[PDB]
Design a binder for this molecule. Structure first.
Ligand SMILES: O=C(O)c1ccncc1
Ligand SMILES: [Cl-]
Ligand SMILES: [Cl-]
Ligand SMILES: [Cl-]
Ligand SMILES: [Cl-]
Ligand SMILES: [Mn+2]
Length: 340
């Protein structure tokens, strides 16, 4: 039967089932006030699916100049055409290659650039903004979005949305690597998976995806979404409570020292955005510091709600297109205040 919601992460994570249910807020707000992330499924079914394909982005915008990042080693690939990224999104043998002759796992950096998303893509913008879940929190003018309502004593988010476009990580070695390293944001965000590209060429990569999710510490209810409903999984997230950030900094300072980094006792390994917590570091965080995370698999059409100040990392399993809107909820407004 259709239900309003379910739980993932053994009851620690709310999953809302209907993105346009006008009563979602009553369930949402109790979980959110406690600083938990929230998942809303089914957003893809509300969108104009033809607007969110990699072929359309290449055809319409292929001639713009951009930089990419090699996810395996962090190297910048400078001043290439945005078609060089998109045409290899799903066809492996079209990807830029590294010195070793392997097809590279790439991230498109800052595209569309800064705040130009609405000017460059006004139909996409309309399609996203009209279908975001919890609209009183997430729309630019929502009754519970304080973004446009706060003085300069608060850090206000840039006008979005932001696009996050990147290939999936492939091999056993890539299991220890991030699409996006551990970092925190001073605003709230809703991040929506609008497209998951399962490749072809080396299209027999189904089994390393299960070992990544398994070793990623994903729950049994989450593994059932693959094997029973055949939903497409895009990315593996780890998110931590805002209250645990300083314990995460102490660990990463200790591990820096152990690896002979030379860093002042004050420097911020979260703000550096230089760490991905692999199974070894996540186990050590739990055991030595008492800190437990939420391991979240974002499928096509899942919306991930990210509490302000909450450290998070993402590991794309397959090539992903996602779009995120920043907002400022009353529940978390402390995290963007500039005093005390
Ligand atoms: O690459 C992502 O998916 C991402 C980047 C930054 N914050 C959240 C998610
Ligand atoms: Cl558009
Ligand atoms: Cl709402
Ligand atoms: Cl990063
Ligand atoms: Cl908080
Ligand atoms: Mn982020």
């Amino acid at each position: 039967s259709m239900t309003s919601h379910s739980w993932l992460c053994d009851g620690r994570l709310l999953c809302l089932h209907d993105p346009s249910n006008k009563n979602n807020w009553k369930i949402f707000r109790e979980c959110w006030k406690q600083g938990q992330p929230v998942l809303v499924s089914g957003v893809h079914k509300k969108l104009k699916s033809e607007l969110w394909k990699p072929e359309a982005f290449s055809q319409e915008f292929g001639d713009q100049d951009v930089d990419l990042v090699n996810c395996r080693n962090c190297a910048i690939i400078s001043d290439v055409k945005v078609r060089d990224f998109w045409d290899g999104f799903e066809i492996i043998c079209k990807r830029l290659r590294s010195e070793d002759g392997q097809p590279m796992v790439l991230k498109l950096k800052d595209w569309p650039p800064g705040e130009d998303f609405r000017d460059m893509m006004p139909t996409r913008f309309e399609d996203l903004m009209e279908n975001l879940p919890l609209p009183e929190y997430t729309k630019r003018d929502g009754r519970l979005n304080l973004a446009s309502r706060l003085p300069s004593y608060f850090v206000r988010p840039d006008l979005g949305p932001k696009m996050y476009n990147a290939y999936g990580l492939i091999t056993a070695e890539d299991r220890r690597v991030g699409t996006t390293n551990l970092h925190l944001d001073v605003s709230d965000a809703v991040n929506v998976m609008v497209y998951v590209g399962i490749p072809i060429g080396e299209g027999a990569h189904d089994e390393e995806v299960l070992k990544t999710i398994d070793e990623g510490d994903a729950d049994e209810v989450t593994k059932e979404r693959i094997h029973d409903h055949k939903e497409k999984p895009g990315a593996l997230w780890h998110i931590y409570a805002a209250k645990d950030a300083e314990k995460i900094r102490e660990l990463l300072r200790k591990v820096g020292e152990e690896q002979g980094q030379e860093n002042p006792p004050d420097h911020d390994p979260i703000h550096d955005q230089s760490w991905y917590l692999d199974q070894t570091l996540r186990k050590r965080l739990y055991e030595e510091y008492g800190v437990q995370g939420w391991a979240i698999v974002q499928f096509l059409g899942d919306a991930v709600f990210i509490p302000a100040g909450a450290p998070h990392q993402v590991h794309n399993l397959y090539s992903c297109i996602k779009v995120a809107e920043d907002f400022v909820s009353p529940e978390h407004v402390k995290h963007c205040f500039r005093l005390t």
